[PDB]
């Protein structure tokens, strides 16, 4: 289930693409891996740009 760097849609140049990278996961205490995945909000139920339009 670990992301295996194939799912990454790279934007860095070709010479910067890792040949073998694994996502850091909370199993094994995050002590192994190469990258992480960030998201804007933990739970995403509302559109922020709509709140601006409402006010």
């Amino acid at each position: 289930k670990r992301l295996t760097q194939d799912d990454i849609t790279f934007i860095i140049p070709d010479y910067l693409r890792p040949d073998y990278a694994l996502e850091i996961e909370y199993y094994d205490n995050c002590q192994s891996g190469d990258f992480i995945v960030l998201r804007n909000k933990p739970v995403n139920l509302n559109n922020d740009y709509q709140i601006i339009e409402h006010y």
């Binding site: 670990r2 295996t4 073998y20 694994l22 094994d28 002590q31 192994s32 891996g33």
Partner: peptide
């Protein structure tokens, strides 16, 4: 052969962990 892929990932993780631990 997803099981072999999982085993390879586990071994690579262990190698990285031990290499980081040594230094």
């Amino acid at each position: 052969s997803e099981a072999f892929v999982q085993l390879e990932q586990r071994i690579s993780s262990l190698e990285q962990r031990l290499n980081n631990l040594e230094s």
